[PDB]
Each structure stands twice: as C-alpha cells, then as structure tokens.
Motif scaffolding. Structure first.
Motif, PDB file in Angstrom:
ATOM      1  N   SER A  61      78.526  90.926  89.249  1.00 25.80           N
ATOM      2  CA  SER A  61      79.021  90.980  87.699  1.00 25.80           C
ATOM      3  C   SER A  61      78.936  89.752  87.220  1.00 25.80           C
ATOM      4  O   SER A  61      79.228  89.530  85.952  1.00 25.80           O
ATOM      5  N   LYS A  64      76.683  89.413  84.199  1.00 29.50           N
ATOM      6  CA  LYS A  64      77.102  89.654  82.950  1.00 29.50           C
ATOM      7  C   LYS A  64      77.214  88.420  82.014  1.00 29.50           C
ATOM      8  O   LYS A  64      77.016  88.568  80.723  1.00 29.50           O
ATOM      9  N   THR A  67      73.692  87.936  80.891  1.00 26.02           N
ATOM     10  CA  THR A  67      73.259  89.131  79.635  1.00 26.02           C
ATOM     11  C   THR A  67      74.060  88.614  78.430  1.00 26.02           C
ATOM     12  O   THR A  67      73.314  88.673  77.346  1.00 26.02           O
ATOM     13  N   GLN A 117      80.451 103.052  85.906  1.00 24.41           N
ATOM     14  CA  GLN A 117      79.124 103.244  86.577  1.00 24.41           C
ATOM     15  C   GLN A 117      78.100 104.008  85.925  1.00 24.41           C
ATOM     16  O   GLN A 117      78.518 105.030  85.438  1.00 24.41           O
ATOM     17  N   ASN A 149      79.809  98.631  83.709  1.00 25.09           N
ATOM     18  CA  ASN A 149      78.424  98.480  83.711  1.00 25.09           C
ATOM     19  C   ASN A 149      77.547  99.208  82.721  1.00 25.09           C
ATOM     20  O   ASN A 149      76.580  98.691  82.231  1.00 25.09           O
ATOM     21  N   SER A 150      77.891 100.392  82.227  1.00 24.33           N
ATOM     22  CA  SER A 150      76.987 101.189  81.406  1.00 24.33           C
ATOM     23  C   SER A 150      77.137 100.892  80.146  1.00 24.33           C
ATOM     24  O   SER A 150      76.484 101.225  79.092  1.00 24.33           O
ATOM     25  N   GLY A 153      75.487  96.936  80.122  1.00 22.75           N
ATOM     26  CA  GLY A 153      74.238  97.294  80.539  1.00 22.75           C
ATOM     27  C   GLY A 153      73.252  97.587  79.327  1.00 22.75           C
ATOM     28  O   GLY A 153      72.300  97.241  79.073  1.00 22.75           O
ATOM     29  N   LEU A 213      70.087 100.081  84.894  1.00 22.03           N
ATOM     30  CA  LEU A 213      70.536  99.072  84.172  1.00 22.03           C
ATOM     31  C   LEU A 213      71.250  97.962  85.117  1.00 22.03           C
ATOM     32  O   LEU A 213      72.096  97.078  84.893  1.00 22.03           O
ATOM     33  N   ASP A 214      70.666  98.029  86.278  1.00 21.85           N
ATOM     34  CA  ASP A 214      71.309  96.900  87.500  1.00 21.85           C
ATOM     35  C   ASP A 214      70.934  95.344  86.846  1.00 21.85           C
ATOM     36  O   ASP A 214      71.783  94.622  87.108  1.00 21.85           O
ATOM     37  N   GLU A 216      70.966  94.108  83.946  1.00 18.49           N
ATOM     38  CA  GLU A 216      71.624  93.915  82.815  1.00 18.49           C
ATOM     39  C   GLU A 216      73.030  93.695  83.287  1.00 18.49           C
ATOM     40  O   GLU A 216      73.631  92.987  82.697  1.00 18.49           O
ATOM     41  N   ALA A 217      73.619  94.528  84.267  1.00 19.78           N
ATOM     42  CA  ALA A 217      74.991  94.539  84.735  1.00 19.78           C
ATOM     43  C   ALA A 217      75.238  93.676  86.114  1.00 19.78           C
ATOM     44  O   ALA A 217      76.527  93.193  85.864  1.00 19.78           O
ATOM     45  N   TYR A 218      74.444  93.509  86.818  1.00 21.69           N
ATOM     46  CA  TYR A 218      74.937  93.061  88.311  1.00 21.69           C
ATOM     47  C   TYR A 218      73.623  92.676  88.726  1.00 21.69           C
ATOM     48  O   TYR A 218      74.031  92.219  90.267  1.00 21.69           O
TER      49      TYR A 218
END
Ligand SMILES: CC(=O)Nc1sccc1C(=O)O
Ligand SMILES: CC(=O)Nc1sccc1C(=O)O
Length: 358
Positions: A61, A64, A67, A117, A149-150, A153, A213-214, A216-218
């Motif tokens: 994370s 982020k 991002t 998630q 994350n959602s 993301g 969305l991996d 973008e989030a982690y």
C-alpha cells in the motif's frame, strides 16, 4: 554514514529484525536532505542472496502514495478535478448511489463504504463494472473513512483516462521517469528479476498475486535507493522541474479530511509535527480488519503543511514497508522488509530513529 546516524539506525533495526524474525531489510535515512543506506539479511533465503541497495521489494500500500501523486499531476495538468463526479469518467456507472460520489471521495476512502478488497472473483473489466454498480454504500458520501483498495484503486484508474495512457504508462512517463526512479516498477521486468526479493509468509517464499486494480492500490516494487529519492522529492517538491508533478506532490500532501490527530491526503497521511508517538505507533493499526471512522471535512483543504509527520504503511502477503518524513526538518526514513510484520513495530522504529536525529 555519520556515526550518529549509523548508531541510531543499527541500535533500532538490529533488535527489530531479531524480534520480528525478518529475513531481509533495507533502510534509508534522509538527513539534511542527503540519503544514507543500510541493509541486512536475505532477499532470497534458499538461494542465499543478500539484500543490497538494488534489491526490489513489494511496497504494497505504500504504492498509494504514487497513485495519489499521479492523480495530483493529472489535476495539475487540468485533465481531471477532484470535485468531478466519478460518472464523468465512467459513464457506464449509472447506478443512482453514485450520484454525489466525486473523485475526492474515491481518492480519500470517503465514498461511503467501498470495501477494503476488490473480490478475487472480479477478473474481467465487465466484472469490475458490475462490482461497482452493485455496491451499496452504507453511508452518505463524505461522512466516514474506510481504508479501501477498491476506493483509491478506482481513483487511479479513472484519473488517467483523459491522458489516454494506461495507468502503468502514465505512472512511468509522468512520475517515475521525471524523478529518475529507474528501478521502480508496476511489473518487474525480466532484466530485474535477479534483484526481486522473495516475500516470506509462514516461512514460504511468496510474491504478490495479480488482482483487479492491483497496480493502482498495492502494485509497485522499488529499491531502497529509488524510495530514498521518492522521499527527497516529497520533502522538497518545489525543487522538481516538472511543474505539474511539483503541483501534484503538493496536492497529495494537502489535508482533505480529519479523523482524530490524522489528516488524509491523496495516498499520504499526515499528522502535525511534533507528533505524539503513541498517536502514530498505536494508530498504525491493521490488526484491525475494518475500522470505520467519522471524518471532518477540511473546507477547503489545507495545502501541504511543512510542519507534518507525513507517512504511509504498506504490506503484501510477504512484505512490510513504511515511509515517513518531516518536510520542516528535511528528515525522513524508508524501511523495506520481506516479511509483513506488525505496523506498530514499524512506526515505533521509525519514530525512535527520526526523533533521535531531529
Ligand atoms: C478530531 C476529529 O476526529 N474530529 C471530527 S471527526 C468527525 C467530525 C469531527 C469534528 O470535529 O466535527
Ligand atoms: C495488498 C495485500 O495483499 N495486502 C495484504 S495480503 C496479506 C496481508 C496484507 C496486509 O496489508 O496486511
């Protein structure tokens, strides 16, 4: 390094590695703006490969923060606005619960209860649409924060749509390349696999699995050198030559919401400095699977405050990362490990080091 830096780093980190049984670790201290590196242990236990300044760790994370800055840069370019409705960039999101949910809300986990998630069963892009269309908020937008994350993301995915670039291409060209982060990756290239540490979970070597969305989030992987450069860039953004990127960094460190002593940025989180170490050590959480907190809107947001403890924790199944910096003091730290060990131990170690050097 100067002996003072050597001694505080080693006296803190040696015991941490022992206590937490961390296979391998890299630390950077930024002191008066200059980086000092330290490494210990193994990137790959079976192959007996040491951690070096070139070892790639999964940031989890901490991604982020990238991002948030990439989104900040898109704002600075005039491509998006945080006040824009989500549906401006995803018009197929016609479900009425989306009325009133802005890019700000996605970026800051305040959309009304988007979950931590994205489900594993979400493979395809049509699955992603269906997921968001069917999600029912528990709360009105801009009322409660639930780390997700959602949420961020989807912010990252939407923020790059006007550019016409993939998220990865946008991140490469607009953030990594200008900052000379030449060993930072969304997808580790074959050329760099030799340097990609394994993560360790229950003694097993593991890497992060693909998910929606991996990236973008982690999904970022980086070296201790590039992460030190990331901290330097965030410590002194108005020294970055690329005007929209400078502005994007400042936007990401601005304070949009308050919950207790903490302020929510774009990716970054902030506290006023000097911080009460119990306010960040114990606050670093996560052990809590879900903590819903009411937020106070900061209307309008407070531009990046120099006198801040700015930080982010991150994990994957096999890795644990932490970054913290204090712009006022031109001081910061990065801690990258290939075990996901408790957040409070991270923050405690970081605090001890930075407090000693401040
Ligand atoms: C300090 C803090 O969390 N303050 C909050 S959370 C939600 C609302 C407020 C407020 O001060 O109105
Ligand atoms: C992003 C991600 O996969 N995070 C994971 S997998 C297992 C634990 C965690 C964590 O963030 O604690």
């Amino acid at each position: 390094a100067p002996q003072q830096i050597n001694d505080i780093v080693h006296r803190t980190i040696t015991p941490l590695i022992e206590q937490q049984k961390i296979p391998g670790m890299a630390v950077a201290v930024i002191y008066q703006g200059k980086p000092y590196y330290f490494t210990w242990g193994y990137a790959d236990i079976a192959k007996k490969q040491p951690v070096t300044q070139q070892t790639l760790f999964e940031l989890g994370s901490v991604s982020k923060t990238f991002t948030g800055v990439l989104g900040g840069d898109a704002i600075a370019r005039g491509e998006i606005k945080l006040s824009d409705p989500t549906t401006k960039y995803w018009p197929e999101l016609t479900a009425k619960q989306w009325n009133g949910i802005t890019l700000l809300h996605l970026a800051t986990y305040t959309a009304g209860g988007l979950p931590l998630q994205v489900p594993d069963e979400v493979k395809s892009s049509s699955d992603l649409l269906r997921f968001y269309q069917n999600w029912q908020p528990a709360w009105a937008p801009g009322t409660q924060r639930l780390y997700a994350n959602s949420s961020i993301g989807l912010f990252g995915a939407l923020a790059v749509k006007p550019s016409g670039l993939s998220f990865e291409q946008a991140m490469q060209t607009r953030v990594f390349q200008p900052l000379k982060l030449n060993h930072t990756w969304i997808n580790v290239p074959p050329a760099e696999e030799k340097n990609y540490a394994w993560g360790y979970r229950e003694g097993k070597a593991v890497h992060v699995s693909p998910g929606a969305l991996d990236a973008e989030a982690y999904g970022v992987k980086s070296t201790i050198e590039d992460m030190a450069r990331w901290v330097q860039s965030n410590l002194k953004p108005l020294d970055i030559n690329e005007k929209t990127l400078q502005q994007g960094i400042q936007l990401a460190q601005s304070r949009y919401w308050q919950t207790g002593d903490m302020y929510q940025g774009l990716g970054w989180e902030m506290l006023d400095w000097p911080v009460n170490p119990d306010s960040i050590i114990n606050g670093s959480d996560n052990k809590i699977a879900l903590a819903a907190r009411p937020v106070k809107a900061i209307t309008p947001p407070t531009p990046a405050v120099r006198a801040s403890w700015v930080h982010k924790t991150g994990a994957t199944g096999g890795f644990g990362s932490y970054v913290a910096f204090i712009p006022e003091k031109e001081l910061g730290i990065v801690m990258l490990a290939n075990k996901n060990y408790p957040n409070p131990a991270r923050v405690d170690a970081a605090w001890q080091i930075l407090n000693a050097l401040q």
